[PDB]
Amino acid sequence: ARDAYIAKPHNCVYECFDAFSSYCNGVCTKNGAKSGYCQILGTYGNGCWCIALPDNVPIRIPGKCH
Domains and CATH numbers, the chain: 1-66 (3.30.30.10)
CA distance 34 to 44: 26
Smallest CA-to-CA distance from 14 within 59, 52, 66 is with 66
| Three-state secondary structure call for residue 28 | helix
Amino acid type, 22: S
Smallest CA-to-CA distance from 46 within 27, 31, 30 is with 27
Smallest CA-to-CA distance from 33 within 57, 52, 49, 8 is with 52
Q: Which long-range contacts (CB under 8 A, 24 or more apart) does 41-44 make?
A: 41/5, 41/15, 42/5
| Three-state secondary structure call for residue 19 | helix
CA–chain centroid gap for 34, Å, is 11
In which region does residue 30 sit, left (phi positive, over 0), alpha (psi from -120 to 50) or beta (all else)? alpha
CB 62 within 8 A of CB 43: no
